[PDB]
Structure 1
Amino acid sequence: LGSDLARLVRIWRALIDHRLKPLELTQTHWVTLHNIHQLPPDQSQIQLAKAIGIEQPSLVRTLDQLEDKGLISRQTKRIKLTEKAEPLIAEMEEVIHKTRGEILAGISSEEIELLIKLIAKLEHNIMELHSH
């Protein structure tokens, strides 16, 4: 079940990746942009790397690639979304929001409160088995 969930997460992200092709970003690139946007300000490289699911050196390379594309700025060092990146992220977020909606068609509002509940339960059981 854990690997059925793992797999579902992978194919959801892959669907979004596929919808975002016109942006000419790798998956690591956009997932990194999205995380910068989503986390509060002034994340450390180490936190962004963890949030993103990649190793530290890959994250460093990603940010250096994102800088070359004018999508992030490191002028302090703090990691900001540039002004050229703001329109892309809005487009990206829009794709993300619309896709979620489509994926959730044919799922009652009932199974949906339920999934949010069972996820939370699972996440709670996992938190508890940590202490143990």
Structure 2
Amino acid sequence: ESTLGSDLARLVRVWRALIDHRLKPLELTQTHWVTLYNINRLPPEQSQIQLAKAIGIEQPSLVRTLDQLEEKGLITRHTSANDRRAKRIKLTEQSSPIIEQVDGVISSTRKEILGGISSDEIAVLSGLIDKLEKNIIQLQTK
């Protein structure tokens, strides 16, 4: 009997565990390291809602995580000029050598994983993530 959804959950859990264990020197929590990885790739003109959503945490959690990062000296929250409602999260100068080790390990770990399999598997696999995801979100609106 088919168990594909559980097997994608498991796959992701083990992968995530590999990155966390390799970052164990930074003594950084999974939420914190995933959140930093995400702030760096996304623009400040993203809502905390989409950021929180981009990471896989809800909005009430992101703030606290960002409050934590604020007390670690790693981020700041600049209240906007044309949108006083919003705040554009920015990584602090002192964060580079940290963003640098999180990213290096995420990239390296990915390329390893995608280094013994074929281009066809990777491409066909790559496309579907986007197909399956689009389709599920479509049903979401029913």
TM-score over 0.5 for the pair: yes
Residue 103 in structure 1 maps to residue 113 in structure 2? yes
2:91 is aligned to: 81
Give how far 1:39 is off: 1.4
Give how far 1:130 is off: 4.6
TM alignment of 1:1-132, pairs within 5 A: 1-76=4-79, 77-130=87-140
C-alpha distance in 1 between matches for 2:91 and 2:98: 10
C-alpha distance in 2 between matches for 1:63 and 1:29: 9
Structure 2: which 5+ runs fail to align?
A: 80-86
Q: TM-score, normalised by structure 1?
A: 0.86
Deviations 1:10-69 (A, max 9, x none): 221111111111112110101111111111223222222111222322211111111111
Give how far 1:120 is off: 3.2
C-alpha distance in 1 between matches for 2:101 and 2:115: 22
C-alpha distance in 2 between matches for 1:78 and 1:65: 17
Structure 1: which 5+ runs fail to align?
A: none
Greater share of strand: 2
Give how far 1:128 is off: 4.4
C-alpha distance in 2 between matches for 1:131 and 1:53: 19
Equivalent residue of 2:115, what SS? Answer: coil
C-alpha distance in 2 between matches for 1:59 and 1:128: 26
Q: Identity percentage over the alignment?
A: 75
